[PDB]
Every structure is written in structure tokens, then in C-alpha cells.
Design a binder for these strands. Structure first.
Ligand code: SF4
Ligand SMILES: [Mg+2]
Ligand SMILES: [Mg+2]
Ligand SMILES: [Mg+2]
Ligand SMILES: [Mg+2]
Ligand SMILES: [Mg+2]
Ligand SMILES: [Mg+2]
Ligand SMILES: [Mg+2]
Ligand SMILES: [Mg+2]
Ligand SMILES: [Mg+2]
Ligand SMILES: [Mg+2]
Ligand SMILES: [Mg+2]
Ligand SMILES: [Mg+2]
Ligand SMILES: [Mg+2]
Ligand SMILES: [Mg+2]
Ligand SMILES: [Mg+2]
Ligand SMILES: [Mg+2]
Ligand SMILES: [Mg+2]
Ligand SMILES: [Mg+2]
Ligand SMILES: [Mg+2]
Ligand SMILES: [Mg+2]
Ligand SMILES: [Mg+2]
Ligand SMILES: [Mg+2]
Ligand SMILES: [Mg+2]
Ligand SMILES: [Mg+2]
Ligand SMILES: [Mg+2]
Ligand SMILES: [Mg+2]
Ligand SMILES: [Mg+2]
Ligand SMILES: [Mg+2]
Ligand SMILES: [Mg+2]
Ligand SMILES: [Mg+2]
Ligand SMILES: [Mg+2]
Ligand SMILES: [Mg+2]
Ligand SMILES: [Mg+2]
Ligand SMILES: [Mg+2]
Ligand SMILES: [Mg+2]
Ligand SMILES: [Mg+2]
Ligand SMILES: [Mg+2]
Ligand SMILES: [Mg+2]
Ligand SMILES: [Mg+2]
Ligand SMILES: [Mg+2]
Ligand SMILES: [Mg+2]
Ligand SMILES: [Mg+2]
Ligand SMILES: [Mg+2]
Ligand SMILES: [Mg+2]
Ligand SMILES: [Mg+2]
Ligand SMILES: [Mg+2]
Ligand SMILES: [Mg+2]
Ligand SMILES: [Mg+2]
Ligand SMILES: [Mg+2]
Ligand SMILES: [Mg+2]
Ligand SMILES: [Mg+2]
Ligand SMILES: [Mg+2]
Ligand SMILES: [Mg+2]
Ligand SMILES: [Mg+2]
Ligand SMILES: [Mg+2]
Ligand SMILES: [Mg+2]
Ligand SMILES: [Mg+2]
Ligand SMILES: [Mg+2]
Ligand SMILES: [Mg+2]
Ligand SMILES: [Mg+2]
Ligand SMILES: [Mg+2]
Ligand SMILES: [Mg+2]
Ligand SMILES: [Mg+2]
Lengths: 75, 82, 137, 148, 122, 208, 99
RNA sequence: CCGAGGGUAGGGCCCGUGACUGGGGCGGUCGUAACAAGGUAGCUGUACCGGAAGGUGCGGCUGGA
RNA sequence: GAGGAAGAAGCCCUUCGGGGUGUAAACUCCUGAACCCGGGACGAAACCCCCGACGAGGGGACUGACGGUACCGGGGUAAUAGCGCCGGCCAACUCCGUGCCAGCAGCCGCGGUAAUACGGAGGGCGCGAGCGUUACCCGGAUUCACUGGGCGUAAAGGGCGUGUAGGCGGCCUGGGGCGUCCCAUGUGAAAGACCACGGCUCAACCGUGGGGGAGCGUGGGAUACGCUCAGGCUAGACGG
RNA sequence: GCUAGUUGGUGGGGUAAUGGCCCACCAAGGCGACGACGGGUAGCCGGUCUGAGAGGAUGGCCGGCCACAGGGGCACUGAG
């Protein structure tokens, strides 16, 4: 669907734990109710979802991961 | 039964009782049957005890039963002086 | 004709503002009782029983005031103000404590009581009350 | 030589081709504080012209106002169109309990302790006039008594 | 209406509608930021006006305002809201209270600091 | 608590000497007589027409200031007068005057309203022999007010009283000089006092 | 006292009992004018004696049945069908008030 | 016998929601119905018609000469 | 707290003369919150004991959580001030920054390069161990109008009759006394409110006393008006 | 628009005691626009806040009554 409310809490508890949950809510046409997380290092992110899916059976796919840019549009 | 007792008023660290007829079972500062005098135990004024002897004796008369401190006061207002 | 007492008070009030000397009002005992107080109290000269076209009326004689100076010289009225206070649509009884002191005493309040139609001050004196009829000043 | 106390200065507008045009309205009360007031409402091109003008008219229009001990002698309600003023006598400790216009009349009429309430349309200009011809209808026990 | 009409049909007492239902109906409410943008106001006011959608403990999801010059708010910032409407911004029933929870006071504000939650100067 | 702060500035803002500060008030170097215009930058600039409410405001403030009293205590008294039988402007003025801190000043045990408070506070006054250090104390008629022992012999109270020989304290009191007692006699008449204040506008003020 | 009411018998059709109507006048709490008001009391009549139409007095009594706690004290009029009709009228009028 | 309650079935009112679909309020395209006889006096109940305002019939009103 | 300059510095304004913060500070003096030291409560006088009788009456003794507290006596240090506002309503104005941005806002509305309306500073007003904000109630709102509003054109007369309930109802006399008015009486607890007095240093608080009133039970009286019954009338209405 | 223990009767049962309080028979009644029935909300007063007053709004502390003791039902003991 899938479980936007059930996902968000999962962030909330982890989010209490840590930085790299690390959520500003986001939405894209690939799937509903998708959110952005940045993880200090690649490994945290890989632990956190993994934890999610084995533990809670919220089996999902996460796009990623993002590097941040110094764009200075000519205008 | 029905009794004669000190019902407490006044304020904190400033008592002023209202010696009162009241059924045993009421909370002390609750509806009594009849006020029959007061008793400031600290004595901060001329009048500091004032039984209504007439009524005191009627009540007493028909089997109301004073406390100890309430009996002790009634004395000082002559309730039992024969 | 639902309220002959209003009707009289009205006849009167209407009359005065045009400055008439008299006006006939159909006669009833009760009405004479009001007219009694009204003249005794000075709001009218007085009244008399009479007759028009056969049937009994009541001719009420009208006080006013001296002429005035300036433009618009019409005299002060002695009856300035007169309204009912106990319409049939709404009966108003008042107890002795409650008898209205009208206009600071500059005016009166009639009122049927069981000791008779008195003024407020009479009703206060005898120490009674009842149906507040009207008020004048 | 009385006191006076402007109660309303206001601007207003005409309209000629290629421009609005102005005029001024001053509504001054004038009184000796002893028991004589007089309200005047004058209008002119410039403000103080319109205030002096108001003065003149004012004096040309004074009023009785009986004073049974600093209060008025009997409660009264008059109502110059849509606006209703209600006066009401009071004890000496009271003070003038009044709207800001009808107080400027009462103040200068020498009134000291009274109650008012403005009901109806609360336009100053009206409430002022309503007030003037509401004082004007006061009478003393005597004033009456002679009338009957 | 005649007195009989009054006896018969009474006078109808008034009743009032809350402008502040999300507070439900506490003096303040806590919530979590879902969106945090700027909004343009209606005419004749022009500005880039700071605003936050909020999900209140009361259940409702409402949009509130960020008074003061600059704010450390962003999504998931948990903040409390007080009643208070912005005239320019349609639909902003509430105000976000500075200096509480995830909301920093306006830094370096010297005046009216109890509004805008700024602690007193050294 | 009390005001504490420049008291002169007041008398400019209010526009008259509310005698508030001891001997100086009667100098040629008192603030008023030097520079009788409001404190601050615009102190000298032309006055605007004072608003109706503005008038009533200063008046309320002129009075209160004179007795250096908290606007809470003030209004409380003012309400007492209304509920009291009598002329409210008046009874206000007297309920105000029965203040122990005041009565000390009126007797001239202290030079000033302000000072009176400190005397009363450090229990230098006593009412009816018993000591009192509340400056709010409501002096009844026939209260005997006096310095008591360990301060009768004090550099100050002597000085003020030394200086109290050939002046007559006001009509509603009395003063056993150098014995150092006085008697509240009766509550004053509005016209014994002659403060520059119009008790009526105050009444008017607490109306709006 | 106990309590004395006066009013029209406005039905039997029960055994030992009469529905009695009872008027009361009083002023409007706020609007002052006088209003009348009414209430039926089921009354006791062991001797199915009191017929319709009657104006009777009934008195506070000890419970005789659920909702029947007055006896009839004494007859004081008779044949007041005019009243009874005014009730049967207000009862009849009701089918026009439905939907 | 009754009986808390559990279960079966059929209704009633409410709330939430739903592909889609009406309209409503707030921020370029087509015309130009109303406001001056507004360029066909307007409004109006009603009917039919028309992209859109609206036009037209029947009767009414002046709040139109 | 009293004194203390035609008036320090600093900072603000300026027509570069000067103004302002300001008797404010400094500073001279005396008073002494806090602290230290000493003594130290009322609330507790009964049950008990003695005389007398295990009665009245009289006498005597035990008992304090609060608390080594309040309070008293002595000694004694100048010892926290903050917050809201300053276009109008509404008491309180200047400069600088910003340039329809940033921001302010309850409402008018402010801000597009001289802003008393934004941000800061000086100055000012308010109140002060508080001062503001939000929420909610009454108020202003005679803006549900009993007191105390309205419907030609502002919202508002039913399209028109007929008539059921209900509302209301002319002139005179008499009986009733339901309404209505009056008197007595019972009730209307205490606490609260109000008036007076007294008790804690005042007050808050508390004690004591006083008056309240609607209401409702009972008894007694009144008869104008409203009701009800009875008689009578012809000015309303109907009919020939 | 509502009502079959529903409304009255009789005779029983029960209680400290009146009553369809419960049970059997008997009659067809009882209630409602003076708002029944359904729905919403709420513990009620002394009081309290406001208000010139009428009024409005409110029932925290305290005093009085009521009701409940995790959600329901039942009785036992007993003066209760
Ligand atoms: S009177 Fe005393 S206080 Fe008031 S200004 Fe003159 S000097 Fe300063
Ligand atoms: Mg004259
Ligand atoms: Mg009018
Ligand atoms: Mg713009
Ligand atoms: Mg624009
Ligand atoms: Mg600040
Ligand atoms: Mg007031
Ligand atoms: Mg039976
Ligand atoms: Mg079952
Ligand atoms: Mg079941
Ligand atoms: Mg089960
Ligand atoms: Mg839907
Ligand atoms: Mg649906
Ligand atoms: Mg056109
Ligand atoms: Mg056209
Ligand atoms: Mg046309
Ligand atoms: Mg055309
Ligand atoms: Mg047509
Ligand atoms: Mg087409
Ligand atoms: Mg066509
Ligand atoms: Mg046509
Ligand atoms: Mg100089
Ligand atoms: Mg300098
Ligand atoms: Mg300097
Ligand atoms: Mg200088
Ligand atoms: Mg000093
Ligand atoms: Mg210093
Ligand atoms: Mg010690
Ligand atoms: Mg002791
Ligand atoms: Mg302020
Ligand atoms: Mg101002
Ligand atoms: Mg500001
Ligand atoms: Mg600028
Ligand atoms: Mg402002
Ligand atoms: Mg500014
Ligand atoms: Mg304080
Ligand atoms: Mg309001
Ligand atoms: Mg007001
Ligand atoms: Mg109102
Ligand atoms: Mg009002
Ligand atoms: Mg309205
Ligand atoms: Mg009305
Ligand atoms: Mg209106
Ligand atoms: Mg018509
Ligand atoms: Mg229609
Ligand atoms: Mg129709
Ligand atoms: Mg008809
Ligand atoms: Mg009829
Ligand atoms: Mg009738
Ligand atoms: Mg009649
Ligand atoms: Mg009677
Ligand atoms: Mg009581
Ligand atoms: Mg008392
Ligand atoms: Mg007849
Ligand atoms: Mg059966
Ligand atoms: Mg059958
Ligand atoms: Mg009924
Ligand atoms: Mg509940
Ligand atoms: Mg509550
Ligand atoms: Mg309670
Ligand atoms: Mg249980
Ligand atoms: Mg259980
Ligand atoms: Mg249970
Ligand atoms: Mg037992």
C-alpha cells in the first residue's frame, strides 16, 4: 500500500535512537508516501532498513543513496 | 447515637470550635443538628466559651452524650451545677 | 375595544397634544376613579359626567401652560407623559415594597388596589399594593 | 465669557470636476460651569475659522439646566433621531458617568454627579443635540408645582 | 412580538463557533511538523511568509505560523501551538510558540522578548 | 514594592510639587523651581491637547504618587470607599490618610512620605505603646502614635522634632512634642488637606 | 396538609378509576403574563360512582397503583361536558398534526 | 422459572471512506447580459431553446418614458 | 532613607549655541532585610488522683506532631528587578538600520530609500515579584431587546379567505374570593455574600453578632382591577 | 406519534412498608404539540464569575444529596 503510518512510527522510534532515520517526509510517482533519510555512513542506512525488514516484516525497497551538491545555476 | 461535640472551624493554627449537637456518624465539620455554644481554646477574647445552657440541658436531657472535652466545657457554663 | 382604560389615557394624550379644552371619553365608574386622582393631583382641571347622542360620556377638562415666547410658542403641557403599565395582554401586579417611585416624585403612578384606586404615595402610606395602572408626568 | 471645549472637529468633502474640495466642521460646547451651557456647531474652509464660528453660534444658544445640588433633578430619556440619550440623577460621590460627548455638556453645565448611557445611533453630532434638548426638558419640584 | 408570542416561542439564545477547534479546546497544543514552507499572503500584502503544517496531539492536522526573524524549524521539529490567526494568510488558525520544544527563540532579539522566547542578555 | 528611583522626574511629569523628598523640596534647587517640564528628550517640546482619558490618568497618578503607594493597595482602598457609606472622593482621601506610614509624616516624626516608611518598617513607631511595623496600618481615631524607647534617643528623630517646636501639626491630630507622641483625633475633611489633586477625576478614572 | 386538587373527570373506561384533569394558573417567570397549564391524575373511585363530566376534588393518598395516587374527595359540580369536549377536542385535533 | 452474558438472523440511525461525478469559494480564453433609453427599458413566475452570459413566448411589477 | 551641581563621565539628540538621561550616580551622614547570639510559647485540660458519695461543687497531677518554630531581648551587613507597551482606539517620540524585503497585526492597516506602525538604540508610559500571551465565561452587544429592538424602500406581513385550539374582550348590581394585595406564623442549614465589632503587629484569614429576600406550607384580613357564578343593560356584534 | 405488565381491576407473592414491585385471571385501557417517543449532552443544589439591574454563564475547593468502586450480574450476614 503500503503502511505509511506503520512506517512513520518505525522512524519515530529509531529516530529517537539516531540521526540517520532520518526523515523529512517525501512522495514520488514510483510509489506512495515515500520518505528521504540521510545516513552518516552507508552502513547505518543498511543496518536500519535491514533491521526493519527482518524484524517487522515491512519488506520494502529503498532507492538511494544520495551525495549532496554545490550547484550554482548560472542565472 | 447523637452527641455533643467540638466541631472545628477557625483556621490553621487558630482554632475556634462550635460546640454542637450532632449524630455520632457525621463528619465533624458537617451538618449538625444545633449549635449550642462556642469554645475558643486559645482564649483570645472575653467570651471564649458560651454554652446555651437551656438547650444543652434539654439535649443532654433526652440522651445525647457529650464528649469528654465537650462535657468538661459544659461544666464551666454550669450545665450540671445543681 | 380591548382596553378602555388605555383608550381613555390615549384619548387624553391625543387630545392634549392638539391643545383641546375637553375631550369626551365613554363613561365607566373605574374611569372616573382615574380622573379623580388626575385632577386632585393637578394633571387635569377636572371632569364631569355628560351625554352624547343618548349614551353616557365623560368630559375631561384640560390644563396646559402659559404661552411661550420665540418661534413655536405652544404652551408646556401639564400632562407631558401618560402610558399604560398593565395592558390586558400583560397584567402587572406590584407588592408594597415594589411600588414604583415615578420620575423622582415629580410624577405619579395610579394603581387599583383592594383599598381603592390610590396613587403610589397613597398606596405606600396605607401599606398595600396591586395592579399598576399607568403613569403620569 | 465662558469656558468652551471642542467635541468634534471633522473634515468633509464636496466634488468639483477635476478635484474633491474641502470644508471643516467644529462642534464646540460652551459653558460657565455654573449652570449655563450652550452647544454650537460651525463649519468653514479652515479649521480655526470653523472653530470660532462654532463658538459664536454656541453662545447664541444657551440653556437653563436646573441644578438640584450638582446633579440633575429627575431622570430623563430623550431621543433626537435614532440616537437616544438617558440622563439620571446621582449621589454626590458618583462623578460624571458619561459618554465623551454628553460629558462635555454636563461638565460645562456644572453637573458633577450623574449617569448616562448612549443608546441608539451613537453619532456625536446627534448625541450632542439629543443631549441639549434633554437638559432643556428638566424641571424642579417647584417648576412643576406651579404648572398645577 | 406580543407577550403571548414570547410565552409561545421564547427568545432564542445565541451560541458561538470556535475559531480554534484544533486546540480542542486546550489553551495550547503540541504537534509535529509535516511541512515547512513559505506562503504568499493575499492582497495588498507582499511577502515570503513562513508557515508550518502541524499534526497536533488532538488529532487534527492544522497549519500554523512562525513569528520572528528566522527559525530553526524543519520537518519533524516538534513544536507547540497557541491560538492566534494570521489575517493575511487564509487558513492559518494558529501560531507556533517560539522558545518551546524544537523551536528556538529568535536569536539576538532585544525587544518584546517574552513573545518570541529570547532569554535575557548578559 | 514601593517605587524607589528618581522622585523628581515625577513632579515634572505630573506638573507640580507633590512634596516627595524631604527638606530639598523647599530649596531654590528643588527640581520643579529649576526646570518645571516633563522628564526626557521631548520635555521641552510643545504640548498636544491632552486626551480626555489622559487628564483623568495623570490625576489618578498625581494622587497615588503623593502617597507613594502600590497601584494594587491603591485600588483596593478606592473600592473600599465605594462600598463605604459617604462621599467617595472624600472617604477615599481619608481611608488613604489613616495610613500609619502617612500619619508619621503628618506628625513630622519623619521629614517625608518616603522616609516615614523606613521608620515604620524598622519598628520605630508604635501605635498605642505596642509596636507596629506595617506601613499599611489603618490608624483609628484615638490611636496614640509615638516613637518608642530605643530610638527616641536617636540622631534623626530628635533632629526632625527639634525642628518641630514652633510649627502646628494639622487640625485633625495633636502632638506631645519632645515627649514624642501624637494622637489621631478624627478622620480629616477633604478641605483640611489641600493637595493639588481633584479627587473627583480619580473617581471618574476608575469608571471607564 | 395532604393535597387538594379540583378538576374535570375527563374519562372513565377503566375500572374503579377516573382520569381527572386539573388546571393551574401562574405568571411567566420572565414574561409575567398569566398562563394556565394542566395535568391528568388517575383518581381512585372504589364505587365506580363518579361519572364523566363531573367537577371533583381529589386528595393526596397512599399508592393504590403505579401512577394512581389520588382518591376522589367529593363531587362539587356535574355535567361539565363543555370542558370534557374541550379536551376531547384537543385530543381529536392531533391527527392533523402528524406527517 | 428467571438469569449476566455468549451465539444466529433481519432491520434502524450515525461516523469514516470510495473509481467517478456535481456544483461552491479564493488566486488566462470567449464574448458583453446588467448599471445612462446601457445602445432591444429592466425586473420577474414559467416554458422552450442556446458555447456563455442569455434570447424568445405567455402573463405580471415600476423598482421604467 | 535625608542631603547632594545651573548639573561629572558615558550614551542619545542637535539649527554645533545647546538639550536630555539626572538628585540620577558619585559622594557625607543613619536606619539596619539578611545573618550571628540569648531566652521561648498559646493551642492543654479533661478522662486519672484527692476531699465530698463513684453526685453536684472544690482541689491536685499527667500530656505538644507542629517546634527549639512563631514570638521576645540583645548584637548586625546597604542588601534582587523585572516585564508589557510608546501610528489610532490608548498613557507614552526622537535617531539609526531595512526598502512591499525582513518583518508587524486584535482591528483599521503598516512596509514599494527620510517608516513616531518592521529591527536596534536613546528617551518615554504602565505595572512591579511580577509583567505579558493563549484558551474559555459574562461584559460592552437594547447584536434574542422581560426590563429594552424591529418588518413601505435597510433582514423582516403569511398570495387570499374560512375557521379549530389557544390569546384577548364593552355598561351596571350582587354572591364567591382563584388570581392580586396586606398581617401573623413555619420553613428558607451551616459555609458564602452584605453591615457592624473583635482576634492574629496590618491585611489576606478567621471569630462573634446583625439584617437580608425570593420561594413554598398554615391561619387571618382586603375587594379596585383580572377570574367565576347570578341578575340587568344597548353604545360592540347579529337580525327585521 | 409512543405503549401488552402497557393502564385499571381482582386474588395471590414479597417487603419494615404503599405500589404492575413481581405472578394468574379479568376489562381495554395509559401517554402525547402545555412536545409524548427517539436522539444529543449533563451528576444536582448551597454556591461561584460577570452584570446598573434584569439577565447570562458556571457547579473546582467547602457543606448537603445522589451515584459508582476494573466491565457486568447475584445474593448472604445483618438494626442497617
Ligand atoms: S518637590 Fe521635592 S521632589 Fe518634587 S521636584 Fe521639587 S524637589 Fe524633587
Ligand atoms: Mg424653565
Ligand atoms: Mg427611533
Ligand atoms: Mg502589495
Ligand atoms: Mg496591490
Ligand atoms: Mg524584550
Ligand atoms: Mg463597572
Ligand atoms: Mg391495585
Ligand atoms: Mg436473555
Ligand atoms: Mg441478550
Ligand atoms: Mg459466557
Ligand atoms: Mg463523500
Ligand atoms: Mg457515505
Ligand atoms: Mg450590454
Ligand atoms: Mg437586455
Ligand atoms: Mg438593454
Ligand atoms: Mg447591444
Ligand atoms: Mg421570461
Ligand atoms: Mg456550439
Ligand atoms: Mg431563440
Ligand atoms: Mg412581457
Ligand atoms: Mg546647565
Ligand atoms: Mg557627556
Ligand atoms: Mg552628562
Ligand atoms: Mg550637555
Ligand atoms: Mg536619593
Ligand atoms: Mg551607584
Ligand atoms: Mg534563636
Ligand atoms: Mg501547651
Ligand atoms: Mg501595556
Ligand atoms: Mg497616545
Ligand atoms: Mg512590536
Ligand atoms: Mg529611514
Ligand atoms: Mg503597535
Ligand atoms: Mg520601532
Ligand atoms: Mg504582592
Ligand atoms: Mg463576547
Ligand atoms: Mg463599559
Ligand atoms: Mg443582553
Ligand atoms: Mg446591558
Ligand atoms: Mg444580530
Ligand atoms: Mg420587548
Ligand atoms: Mg434593530
Ligand atoms: Mg399582503
Ligand atoms: Mg412562499
Ligand atoms: Mg404558499
Ligand atoms: Mg378570520
Ligand atoms: Mg375562540
Ligand atoms: Mg376569557
Ligand atoms: Mg371585563
Ligand atoms: Mg385569595
Ligand atoms: Mg444559609
Ligand atoms: Mg454569620
Ligand atoms: Mg350577562
Ligand atoms: Mg399477565
Ligand atoms: Mg382482552
Ligand atoms: Mg403538561
Ligand atoms: Mg457524567
Ligand atoms: Mg469545572
Ligand atoms: Mg462538593
Ligand atoms: Mg462491581
Ligand atoms: Mg467484580
Ligand atoms: Mg459494577
Ligand atoms: Mg450488626
Amino acid at each position: 500500500s503500503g503502511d505509511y503510518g506503520k512506517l512513520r512510527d518505525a522512524l519515530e522510534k529509531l529516530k529517537l535512537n539516531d540521526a540517520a532515520l532520518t526523515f523529512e517526509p517525501e512522495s514520488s510517482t514510483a510509489l506512495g508516501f515515500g520518505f528521504r533519510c540521510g545516513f552518516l555512513g552507508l552502513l547505518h542506512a543498511e543496518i536500519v532498513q535491514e533491521r526493519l525488514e527482518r524484524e517487522f516484516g515491512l519488506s520494502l525497497i529503498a532507492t538511494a543513496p544520495s551525495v549532496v551538491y554545490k550547484v550554482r545555476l548560472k542565472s | 447515637m447523637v452527641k455533643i461535640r467540638l466541631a472545628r472551624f477557625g483556621s490553621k493554627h487558630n482554632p475556634h470550635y462550635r460546640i454542637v449537637v450532632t449524630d455520632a456518624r457525621r463528619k465533624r465539620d458537617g451538618k449538625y443538628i444545633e449549635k449550642i455554644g462556642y469554645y475558643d481554646p486559645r482564649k483570645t477574647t472575653p467570651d471564649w466559651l458560651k454554652v446555651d445552657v437551656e438547650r444543652a440541658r434539654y439535649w443532654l436531657s433526652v440522651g445525647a452524650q457529650p464528649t469528654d472535652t465537650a462535657r468538661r466545657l459544659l461544666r464551666q457554663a454550669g450545665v450540671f451545677r445543681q | 375595544l380591548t382596553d378602555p382604560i388605555a383608550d381613555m389615557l390615549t384619548r387624553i394624550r391625543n387630545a392634549t397634544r392638539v391643545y383641546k379644552e375637553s375631550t369626551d371619553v365613554p363613561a365607566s365608574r373605574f374611569k372616573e376613579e382615574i380622573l379623580r386622582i388626575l385632577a386632585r393631583e393637578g394633571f387635569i382641571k377636572g371632569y364631569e359626567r355628560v351625554d352624547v347622542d343618548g349614551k353616557p360620556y365623560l368630559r375631561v377638562y384640560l390644563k396646559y401652560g402659559p404661552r411661550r415666547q420665540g418661534p413655536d410658542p405652544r404652551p408646556e403641557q401639564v400632562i407631558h407623559h401618560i402610558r399604560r403599565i398593565s395592558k390586558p395582554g400583560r397584567r402587572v401586579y406590584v407588592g408594597v415594597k415594589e411600588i414604583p417611585r415615578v420620575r423622582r416624585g415629580l410624577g405619579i403612578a395610579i394603581l387599583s388596589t383592594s383599598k381603592g384606586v390610590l396613587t403610589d404615595r397613597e398606596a405606600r402610606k396605607l401599606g398595600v399594593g396591586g395592579e399598576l395602572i399607568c403613569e403620569v408626568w | 465669557d465662558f469656558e468652551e471645549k471642542m467635541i468634534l472637529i471633522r473634515r468633509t468633502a464636496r466634488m468639483q470636476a477635476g478635484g474633491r474640495r474641502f470644508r471643516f466642521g467644529a462642534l464646540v460646547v460652551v459653558g460657565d460651569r455654573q449652570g449655563r451651557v450652550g452647544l454650537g456647531f460651525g463649519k468653514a474652509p479652515e479649521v480655526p475659522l470653523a472653530v470660532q464660528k462654532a463658538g459664536y453660534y454656541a453662545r447664541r444658544n444657551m440653556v437653563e439646566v436646573p441644578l438640584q445640588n450638582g446633579t440633575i433633578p429627575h431622570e430623563i430619556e430623550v431621543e433626537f433621531g435614532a440616537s437616544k440619550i438617558v440622563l439620571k440623577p446621582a449621589a454626590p460621590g458618583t462623578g460624571v458617568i458619561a459618554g465623551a460627548v454628553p460629558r462635555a455638556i454636563l461638565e460645562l453645565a456644572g453637573v458633577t454627579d450623574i449617569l448616562t448611557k448612549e443608546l441608539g445611533s451613537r453619532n456625536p453630532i446627534n448625541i450632542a443635540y439629543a443631549t441639549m434638548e434633554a437638559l432643556r426638558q428638566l424641571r424642579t419640584k417647584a417648576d412643576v408645582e406651579r404648572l398645577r | 412580538p406580543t407577550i403571548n408570542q414570547l410565552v409561545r416561542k421564547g427568545r432564542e439564545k445565541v451560541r458561538k463557533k470556535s475559531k480554534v477547534p484544533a486546540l480542542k479546546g486546550a489553551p495550547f497544543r503540541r504537534g509535529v511538523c509535516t511541512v515547512v514552507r513559505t506562503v504568499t499572503p493575499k492582497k495588498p500584502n507582499s511577502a515570503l511568509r513562513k508557515v508550518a503544517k502541524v499534526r497536533l496531539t488532538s488529532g487534527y492536522e492544522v497549519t500554523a505560523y512562525i513569528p520572528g526573524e528566522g527559525h530553526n524549524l524543519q520537518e519533524h521539529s516538534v513544536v507547540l501551538i497557541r491560538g492566534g490567526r494570521v489575517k493575511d494568510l487564509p487558513g492559518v488558525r494558529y501560531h507556533i510558540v517560539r522558545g518551546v520544544y524544537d523551536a528556538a527563540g529568535v536569536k539576538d532579539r532585544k525587544k518584546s522578548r517574552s513573545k518570541y522566547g529570547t532569554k535575557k542578555p548578559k | 514594592g514601593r517605587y524607589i528611583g528618581p522622585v523628581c522626574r515625577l513632579c515634572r511629569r505630573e506638573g507640580v510639587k507633590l512634596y516627595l523628598k524631604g527638606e530639598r523640596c523647599y530649596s531654590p534647587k528643588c527640581a520643579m523651581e529649576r526646570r518645571p517640564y516633563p522628564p526626557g528628550q521631548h520635555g521641552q517640546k510643545r504640548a498636544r491637547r491632552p486626551s480626555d482619558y489622559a487628564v483623568r490618568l495623570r490625576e489618578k497618578q498625581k494622587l497615588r504618587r503623593i502617597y507613594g503607594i502600590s497601584e494594587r493597595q491603591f485600588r483596593n482602598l478606592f473600592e473600599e470607599a465605594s462600598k463605604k457609606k459617604g462621599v467617595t472622593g472624600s472617604v477615599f482621601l481619608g481611608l488613604l490618610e489613616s495610613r500609619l506610614d502617612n500619619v508619621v509624616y503628618r506628625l513630622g516624626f519623619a521629614v517625608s512620605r518616603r522616609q516615614a516608611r523606613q521608620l515604620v518598617r524598622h519598628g520605630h513607631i508604635t501605635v498605642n505603646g505596642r509596636r507596629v511595623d506595617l506601613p499599611s496600618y489603618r490608624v483609628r481615631p484615638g490611636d496614640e502614635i509615638a516613637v518608642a524607647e530605643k530610638s527616641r534617643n536617636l540622631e534623626l528623630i530628635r533632629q526632625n522634632l527639634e525642628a518641630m517646636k514652633g510649627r502646628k501639626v494639622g487640625p485633625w491630630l495633636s502632638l506631645d512634642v519632645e515627649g514624642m507622641k501624637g494622637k489621631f483625633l478624627r478622620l480629616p475633611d477633604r478641605e483640611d488637606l489641600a493637595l493639588p489633586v481633584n479627587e473627583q477625576l480619580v473617581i471618574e478614572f476608575y469608571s471607564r | 396538609p395532604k393535597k387538594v386538587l379540583t378538576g374535570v373527570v375527563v374519562s372513565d373506561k377503566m375500572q374503579k378509576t377516573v382520569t381527572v384533569l386539573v388546571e393551574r394558573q401562574f405568571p411567566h417567570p420572565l414574561y409575567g403574563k398569566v398562563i394556565k397549564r394542566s395535568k391528568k391524575y388517575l383518581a381512585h373511585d372504589p364505587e365506580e360512582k363518579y361519572k364523566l363530566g363531573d367537577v371533583v376534588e381529589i386528595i393526596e393518598s397512599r399508592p393504590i397503583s403505579k401512577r394512581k395516587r389520588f382518591r376522589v374527595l367529593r363531587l362539587v359540580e356535574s355535567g361539565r361536558m363543555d370542558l370534557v369536549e374541550k379536551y376531547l377536542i384537543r385530543r381529536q385535533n392531533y391527527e392533523s398534526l402528524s406527517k
